[PDB]
Amino acid sequence: VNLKVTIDLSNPMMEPGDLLHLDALLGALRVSRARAEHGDAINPRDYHYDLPLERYQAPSGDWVFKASAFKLK
RNA sequence: GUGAACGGUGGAGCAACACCUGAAGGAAGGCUUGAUGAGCGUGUUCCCCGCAUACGCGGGG
DSSP assignment of A8-56: --SS--PPPSS--BHHHHHHHHHHHHHHHHH-S-S-HHHHTT--SS-EE
Judge contact between A16 and A66, C-beta under 8 A.
no
Give the technique used to solve this structure.
cryo-EM
Contacts of A49 (CB under 8 A, 6+ apart): A27
- Resolution limit in angstroms? 2.8
Integer distance in angstroms from CA A12 to C1' B11?
30
Spell out the long-range contacts of A50-55 with Cβ–Cβ below 8 A and sequence spacing 24 or more.
Answer: A51/A23, A51/A26, A51/A27, A52/A26, A53/A23, A53/A26
Judge contact between A34 and A42, C-beta under 8 A.
yes
Judge contact between A53 and A23, C-beta under 8 A.
yes
Strand B and A19 CB separated by under 7 Å:
yes
